């Protein structure tokens, strides 16, 4: 079920909640330039469609936290989200921890590096969960995605061709039921999105998954070497889901030449349910 | 064994041949703009260090063949290289066929899409084969390689971390013994380079492999979608070498949106030896 153009009104969607709550999480690591625009794009929904909004500050050392606070957002460190458990690096750790710092029946993730995101992102993502049947996960897609098109989609075609129809498997913008998310392990680092998608599919099949058009995403764009490490972790997570042993050996890069090895992790966090 | 700066003279290298011959192959599909510069970069070696030079025209429909002929090169179609066998599409087919159209003890491959290549490429590549011991394969590297850094090297780190030290595993510029090449299967399409590298390693280990610095490669650069299909075949070939089953399902791309599926092949050509 793919929406190329949503149309629900905020008021329709709110009516459709039927006692269900909605939390929104913005994970953030050093996004001082864009965080404020993102928070402002969503905060008008708070106390209405959105019951709760947090910024999960993931170790920022710039002005991310102060600017987020000044935009009226509740800011939660990785440590505060789950203080009994020492913090590991990477995005996946942050999202997993964010489940402990929220209580919505529905959880929405939005990356904090978006440049002026549309204020209907959140309504568009929750639409299928609210008005559909059996949808537990909603992915975004949009209109240059080097990792997505060179790494994730081609590996999916190779190893889970059934997910070939997912236009943006690595998309940082998505929503899901708490019941699903707290039932799934969380891959480390940049592996978290692909892991959630494959795990969701393996457990519930395609009928539990939707994808919605958010139009065009401005963000961006990153250095090649950081993409290398990201790809490595995506590969590691994807191979693991396909029953394939990963060496655990980090990508090395040669910058004569000097060498650098990036970390990779083969350790998922378990379902947040076990932490109950 | 890695050379960051070769220094053999053409005359030293020629002396070192010791009865061994050298063939050079330029595979070409629609490279009318660059082919002439490449042929000219190498033809001064002919009847000296290089005993034989061919262009393997791989179905070009531009002026590639006429311009190559006008540069004094022997041009060989896929059909002429091996006429008893119907032609399949893709680069790997062309290189495999080129073994039947050459007779050098040493074979050098140079892509025909290079912009003004250095005239010492060929001497630099054959150096380790000529003056080394046990080298059977020489890869080039150089000073943006999206597929190499996002797909091939990270998958190698995952599945053959021993080949992590190869800076340009997908490089189209390399040399090898006929004995090796005619003993190896040839992967289809864009899988051919990675297949030869992994097969070489699995059979002879690293000590049979060298890599040499050619400096800087200008070529280039391609549309994202063509890179998608290339990555898919590289993945398919690499998974196969690692004992991993590939779906055989082609990458689909969505250009509302229209869909296109690119071909992928799980069929290698066998060792050219069997064709004897």
Q: Helices in A29-107 by DSSP H: which ranges?
A: 35-42, 64-70, 78-81, 91-100
> How many Cα atoms occupy the beta-carbon half-sphere of A218 within 13 Å?
7
Number of other CB atoms surrounding residue A212 within 10 Å: 25
For chain A, what are the domain ranges? 1-276
- Return the sign of the alpha-carbon dihedral for residues B7, B11, B17, B22: positive
Please give the structure tokens belonging to residue A57.
């500050």
> Would the annotation count A225 as a binding residue?
no
> Would the annotation count A64 as a binding residue?
no
Q: Note whether A206 contacts B: Cβ–Cβ < 8 A.
A: no
C-alpha B26/C-alpha B98 separation (Å) is 9
The C-alpha torsion from A238 through A240 and A245 to A250, rounded to 10°, is 60
C-alpha A268/C-alpha A233 separation (Å) is 11
Q: Phi/psi at A27 (nearest 5 deg)?
A: -75, 145
C-alpha B102/C-alpha B121 separation (Å) is 19
C-alpha A89/C-alpha B63 separation (Å) is 55
Specify the experimental method: X-ray
C-alpha B156/C-alpha A30 separation (Å) is 31
Residues of A in Cβ contact (< 8 Å) with B264: 157
CB contact at 8 A, B262 and B234: no
Residues of B in Cβ contact (< 8 Å) with A154: 151, 228, 231-232, 235, 251
Q: Note whether A170 contacts B: Cβ–Cβ < 8 A.
A: no
Q: Phi/psi at A4 (nearest 5 deg)?
A: -90, -5
In chain B, which among 3-22 make CB contacts under 8 A with chain A? 4
Return the number of CB contacts < 8 Å for A and B.
102
> Would the annotation count A116 as a binding residue?
no
CB pair distance less than 8 Å for A224 and B149: yes
Q: Which CATH superfamily is domain B1-276 in?
A: Spore Coat Polysaccharide Biosynthesis Protein SpsA; Chain A (3.90.550.10)
Q: Note whether B144 contacts A: Cβ–Cβ < 8 A.
A: yes
| Closest partner CB to B154 (pick from A157, A224, A232) | A232
Residue B272 to residues A235, A250, B53, B99, Cα–Cα distance (Å): 34, 36, 19, 7
């Amino acid at each position: 079920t793919t929406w190329h153009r949503p149309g629900w009104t905020i008021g329709e969607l709110e009516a459709a909640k039927a006692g269900r709550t909605i939390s929104v999480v913005l994970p953030a690591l050093n996004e001082e330039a864009t965080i404020e625009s993102v928070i402002d794009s969503i905060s008008p929904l708070v106390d209405g469609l959105v019951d709760e909004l947090i910024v999960l500050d993931s170790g920022s050392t710039d002005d991310t936290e102060i600017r987020a606070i000044a935009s009226g957002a509740r800011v939660v460190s990785r440590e505060q989200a789950l203080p009994e458990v020492p913090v590991r690096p990477g995005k996946g750790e942050a999202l997993w921890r964010s489940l402990a710092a929220t209580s919505g029946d529905i959880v929405v993730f939005i990356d904090s590096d978006l440049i002026n995101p549309h204020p209907l992102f959140v309504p568009w993502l929750v639409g299928p969960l609210l008005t559909g049947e059996g949808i537990q996960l909603v992915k975004s897609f949009y209109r240059g995605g080097r990792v997505t098109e060179l790494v994730a989609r081609p590996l999916l075609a190779a190893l889970r061709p059934e997910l070939g129809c997912v236009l943006q498997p690595l998309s940082g913008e998505y929503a899901a039921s708490r019941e699903l998310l707290t039932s799934l392990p969380f891959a480390p680092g940049y592996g978290v999105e692909i892991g959630l998608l494959i795990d969701t599919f393996d457990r519930l099949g395609l009928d539990a998954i939707a994808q919605v058009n958010l139009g065009v995403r401005a963000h961006r764009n990153r250095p090649l070497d950081e993409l290398g490490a990201m790809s490595r972790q995506v590969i590691a997570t994807l191979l693991s889901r396909c029953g394939i042993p990963d060496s655990g050996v980090g990508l090395t890069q040669f910058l004569d030449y000097t060498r650098h090895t990036w970390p990779v992790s083969l350790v998922d966090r378990p379902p947040m349910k076990v932490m109950r």
